[PDB]
């Protein structure tokens, strides 16, 4: 029992330190990507603070299992290097007993990760998406110079402006037209008009009531003998906020109570993914114990990089299977469970290597 408390307190502290370092690194890595979009001027650089505070629960869901993996590796390597475990196995301690001792601090991490992945990360992601949609769309429309006009990616909103204005009054004039004719093969595909109007009548989050009293439609399909030119009023330009749809998805914010009963493959793959990190904790704990046996020449800082690579590959396989399963390609009976089975098997063949060799030695 004394050994149990000693091992648990030696593992938990190292896990905590490694998790803190990993969290700092991941937060910095995400900041260096959000700051680029801030530099483009798309998003207010005063709200990057909250976004981090709302996204960190989503990072302490894939960081904690790796923190436990590295903590077990480092702690048991330290105990192995100082002959602290040689005198523990020379008084009677099966490696099964060591696994039993290690599985108790892993239970706390599994409980914490299950809570964070089933009841906290969805709430945080929902709040982050809500507050990014609410008031961060004020910078959706940015104008640099009259030389750089507006060419929206929708393929229907392209126009011209003269010298811009801070008050948004001097950038009048409009040459709006859908203009998807190429060789002028269609008539309804252009809404060309001549305008000196286009006042920035922003009512909603960028939505504009830019009705133009100046405009002459040129509907007549060019390249033909049909000249059709009438008066044109305007083409409504409402600006929505597509930032949220580019980075996150609706699935990650659905409460767990809304996935227990459903027929949508995405809403069920999400449930299968959320219940995968508690098993991640136990699988990496099982993998960690046989790996931690090190020699004085190897040191404890040797198999850390392969451990990180293996964990990243495990997560990548989980995500790929989820993304090829929510499409219905894989029937939702095997699920993600075969990935867990594969990694459990490769951990079991590693925990039972020395006993297998001894048995094969007859």
């Amino acid at each position: 029992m004394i050994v149990f408390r000693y091992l648990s307190r030696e593992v938990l502290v190292t896990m905590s330190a490694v998790s803190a370092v990993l969290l700092v690194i991941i937060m910095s890595g995400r900041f260096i990507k959000y700051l680029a979009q801030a530099a483009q001027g798309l998003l207010d650089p005063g709200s990057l603070f909250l976004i981090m505070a709302f996204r960190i629960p989503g990072f302490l869901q894939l960081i904690l299992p790796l923190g436990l993996f590295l903590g077990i590796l480092l702690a048991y390597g330290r105990l192995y290097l100082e002959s602290e475990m040689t005198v523990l196995s020379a008084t009677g301690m099966s490696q099964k007993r060591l696994l039993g001792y290690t599985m108790a601090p892993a239970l706390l991490v599994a409980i914490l990760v299950a809570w964070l992945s089933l009841f906290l990360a969805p709430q945080g992601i929902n709040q982050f998406a809500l507050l990014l949609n609410k008031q961060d769309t004020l910078t959706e429309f940015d104008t640099l110079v009259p030389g750089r006009f507006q060419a929206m990616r929708d393929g229907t909103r392209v126009t011209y402006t003269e010298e811009l204005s801070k008050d948004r009054g001097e950038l009048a004039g409009i040459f709006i037209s859908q203009k998807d004719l190429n060789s002028s093969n269609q008539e309804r595909g252009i809404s060309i008009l001549v305008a000196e109007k286009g006042t920035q009548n922003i009512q909603a989050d960028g939505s504009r009531y830019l009705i133009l009293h100046n405009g002459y439609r040129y509907d007549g399909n060019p390249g033909q003998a049909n000249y059709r030119a009438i008066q044109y009023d305007t083409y409504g330009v409402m600006l929505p906020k597509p930032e949220a749809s580019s980075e996150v998805s609706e699935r990650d914010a659905v409460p767990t109570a809304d996935l227990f009963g459903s027929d949508n493959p995405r809403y069920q793959a999400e449930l299968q993914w959320r219940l995968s990190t508690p098993l991640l904790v136990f699988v990496v704990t099982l993998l960690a114990v046989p790996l931690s046996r090190v020699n004085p020449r190897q040191g404890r800082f040797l198999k850390l990089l392969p451990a990180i690579l293996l964990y990243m590959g495990y997560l990548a396989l989980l995500i790929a299977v989820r993304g090829q399963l929510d499409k219905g390609k894989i029937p939702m009976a095997i699920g993600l469970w075969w990935v867990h089975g594969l990694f459990l098997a490769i951990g079991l063949l590693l925990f039972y290597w020395e006993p297998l060799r001894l048995k094969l030695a007859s």
């Binding site: 060789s183 001549v194 000249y227 059709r228 040191g299």
Partner: protein, 354 residues
């Protein structure tokens, strides 16, 4: 002092080459895994593999400094843990002499990095990007992301896709009158650059008649085009600043200066691509300081782990000071000088502490 110089130089050179090979392999594997998600229809696995392989020199040039740091750490640790640098120091060989011995085969690496990043990286990067864009699409007037818009007093120019070999895919020309009267809806497929004019191809123009006549389609085969655009100008705008040759970056910085638009990202890219030897020298000086200090008798694994951790901490800071120098207002030269400078200062401090 010849044999000691060759011994240390060969050791560090081989270690650096091995580390660079491993890092390049890992980077290519991660990039291919990321690219797998966009495999659809025309973008086959073969095209993705071709793009990944063609973007190898750029990744090697980018990862050269971290590779040099880790390789110097490993190579000097091999000597130090065997208690050979102590013998060299006790034989009368100074410490600055050992630093010079390590840096002698490293000016070669810095020169190779500059050469491969100013002559070889832009070509392969351009070829790979253009090939990926072609494979993904660009058939329509506005289909490919690799597009651009140019305007004159009345001439309107839109290019659907640009080619590395001085060719434009999807040339589109428009003409608006002084009263915003439409006069041309020209379409083209290809163009050839001769003298200063632009030899258009597949000219499917559509010129509007003002009074009552509806436009007509003239399928003229070729026509010289009077445009001030140069193929270098259209190539430079498309490519990202971090994938441009030094001479091209300098010329584009000056050209942006003439028109009055401020240049603050191209300046940062130019400084990063120029001050790379100094950053490498600072990093490897700090690595040499590490070997002679804390990581003296520690194992190889600890040295590799420390090198990787510090490389992460350094690269993250370097990539974080970039957009910060554009959001805020301070010279981009600081964003390149500060991290390398403090690395060199820490290395010198620890070396003087012996």
């Amino acid at each position: 002092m010849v044999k000691l110089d060759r011994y240390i130089g060969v050791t560090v050179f081989v270690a650096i080459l091995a580390v660079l090979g491993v890092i390049l392999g890992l980077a290519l594997l991660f990039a291919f895994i990321d690219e797998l998600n966009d495999i659809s229809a025309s973008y086959g696995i073969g095209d993705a593999l071709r793009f990944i392989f063609l973007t190898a020199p750029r990744r090697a040039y980018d990862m050269l400094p971290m590779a040099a740091l880790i390789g110097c750490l490993v190579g000097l640790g091999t000597l130090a843990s065997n208690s050979e640098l102590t013998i060299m120091r006790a034989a009368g060989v100074s410490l600055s002499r050992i630093v010079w011995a390590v840096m002698k085969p490293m000016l070669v690496l810095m020169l190779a990095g500059i050469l491969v990043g100013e002559y070889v990286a832009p070509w392969t990067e351009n070829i790979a990007q253009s090939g990926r864009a072609l494979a993904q699409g660009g058939g329509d007037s506005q289909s490919s992301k690799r597009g651009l818009w140019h305007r004159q007093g009345r001439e309107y120019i839109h290019i659907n896709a640009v080619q590395p070999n001085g060719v434009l895919y999807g040339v589109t020309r428009y003409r608006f009158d002084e009263q915003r009267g439409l006069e041309s809806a020209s379409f083209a497929k290809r163009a050839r650059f001769e003298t200063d004019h632009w030899q258009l191809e597949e000219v499917t123009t559509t010129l509007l008649h003002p009074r009552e006549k509806r436009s007509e389609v003239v399928k003229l085969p070729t026509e010289r085009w009077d445009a001030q655009l140069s193929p270098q100008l259209l190539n430079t705008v498309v490519m990202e600043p971090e994938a441009l040759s030094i001479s091209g970056l300098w010329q584009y910085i000056h050209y942006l200066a003439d028109q009055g638009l401020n240049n603050n990202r191209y300046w940062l890219a130019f400084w990063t691509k120029v001050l790379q030897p100094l950053v490498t020298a600072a990093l490897v000086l700090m690595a040499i300081s590490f070997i002679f200090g804390p990581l003296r008798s520690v194992t190889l694994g600890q040295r590799i782990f420390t090198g990787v951790l510090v490389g992460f901490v350094f690269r993250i800071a370097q990539d974080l000071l970039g957009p910060s120098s554009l959001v805020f207002d301070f010279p981009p030269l600081l964003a390149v000088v500060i991290p390398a400078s403090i690395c060199a200062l820490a290395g010198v401090w620890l070396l003087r502490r012996a």
